[PDB]
Design a protein around this ligand. Structure first.
Ligand SMILES: NS(=O)(=O)c1c(F)c(F)c(SCCc2ccc(C(=O)O)cc2)c(F)c1NC1CCCCCCC1
Ligand SMILES: NS(=O)(=O)c1c(F)c(F)c(SCCc2ccc(C(=O)O)cc2)c(F)c1NC1CCCCCCC1
Ligand SMILES: [Zn+2]
Ligand SMILES: [Zn+2]
Lengths: 241, 241
């Protein structure tokens, strides 16, 4: 009730139906610069009670295309529980075990509050997390620290790492649509890019993610995804036919 | 010299090469509501020395897509001289006799100065004017008042008119890209939408447009178009296959 933007017509997340997506060959491969960080200075990894977030340093540049430039602010995760998936986006009604969001600010804006609700002011890179056979070493750097931040509102410093190693290797094949933040204030104008390729974590890693953190009260931080929102006439674009 | 933004990477106008345009079926028909203005109140028509400009009232609403809405501010024209075309955009190297620009402000920005340089802050609808056998009634309402404002800096008031009648037939067929103002300050982040189809004016009308107005000094106000700029990797989109 408190935030009217959460009742907007063009909200996220959405159910991606690839057959109804529009092939748009203007959608070129995503470009990331400066994501391969040195170990120092350290970054802050926080259990904010709704997700686990990693705050990103200055100098991480992302482009959705020529002239569509962004700076990375933060990344965070959405996940489920034992035997329950918890991605935000779905594909043909299928929910994936978890989802990573890397949130960026258009280089036309100095602050988030100026970008909120402005077209293209914020851009999110989203990838699904699925079970694979191997321990994912980039994820392990964060997941091995969740026990330190089990309590709601706690944080810890972690060394810099290759942030791009938390995303799929295929930056060419993706869906793109305009939507909203998935937490209040649910501001619209957010460009969502959802990778075709998924990222693989071990079963143990997925369990660590869903079973370690606590939220508000004595409740487990689990199932922290927003319900699917209707496209309401928006057409999802795809970078591939 | 005065405006370094004019040497930016993502400037307008550009040469449109339809075979290299990217078709995206997500580009829906343009929606223009409130454009059928009544005779009163009257509108300001001004020779500002670079173009002739019609100030538009509040209530002219335009959408480039779902939730991507705009309000029209003004329109103005670009033209050549006797036996010389003066459109700004070109199509496969062909320059048309003239070009009309309807400039709009995004409904996420209260002021033009906030929108300048921000992606999608300003949106321009552009149409080519070419020679036809018949006098165009819509354009005559404006062209017949240019003699009154021949001197640089002079202005008059004209009755309200159907602004949409100045535009081409099919609102589903257009090209679109992101670029700049074509005059200082050459601000980037402008969404340009160029109709596929043209509008037709008589040879007398086109002569009236190019031969009536005076600029700065004792110069005729003619050939008021900027040179073609490189795409620099931008891909022009098309709303039709
Ligand atoms: N999917 S999402 O991008 O909308 C998103 C969510 F769905 C989220 F659920 C979250 S976590 C909840 C918001 C929050 C709460 C507390 C704190 C803190 O105490 O430090 C920080 C954040 C979350 F942090 C984000 N992303 C944030 C949204 C906040 C405003 C925009 C800029 C940062 C991205
Ligand atoms: N093609 S374009 O849209 O870039 C464009 C031009 F190429 C133009 F050439 C123009 S006219 C030149 C700018 C100007 C000069 C004086 C006055 C005045 O004293 O009233 C007003 C305007 C012109 F007005 C516009 N459009 C205006 C750009 C300048 C003002 C900021 C944004 C509104 C659109
Ligand atoms: Zn999120
Ligand atoms: Zn213009």
């Amino acid at each position: 009730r408190v935030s009217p933007a959460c009742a907007g017509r063009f909200q996220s997340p959405v159910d991606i139906r690839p057959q109804l997506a529009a092939f748009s060959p203007a959608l070129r491969p995503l470009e990331l610069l400066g994501f391969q960080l040195p170990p120092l200075p350290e970054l802050r990894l926080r259990n904010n009670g709704h997700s686990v977030q990693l705050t990103l340093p200055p100098g991480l540049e992302m482009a959705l295309g020529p002239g569509r430039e962004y700076r990375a602010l933060q990344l965070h995760l959405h996940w489920g529980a034992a035997g329950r998936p918890g991605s935000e986006h779905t594909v043909e009604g299928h929910r994936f075990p978890a989802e990573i969001h890397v949130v960026h600010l258009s280089t036309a804006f100095a602050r988030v509050d100026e970008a909120l609700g402005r077209p293209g002011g914020l851009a999110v890179l989203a990838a699904f997390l699925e079970e694979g056979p191997e321990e994912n070493s980039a994820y392990e750097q964060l997941l091995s620290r969740l026990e330190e931040i089990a309590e709601e509102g706690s944080e810890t410093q972690v060394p810099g790492l290759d942030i791009s190693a938390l995303l799929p290797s295929d930056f060419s094949r993706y869906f793109q649509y305009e939507g909203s933040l998935t937490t209040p204030p649910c501001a619209q104008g957010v460009i969502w890019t959802v990778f075709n390729q998924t990222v693989m974590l071990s079963a143990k890693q997925l369990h660590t993610l869903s079973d370690t953190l606590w939220g508000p009260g004595d409740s487990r931080l689990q199932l922290n995804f927003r319900a699917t929102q209707p496209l309401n006439g928006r057409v999802i674009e795809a970078s591939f036919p």
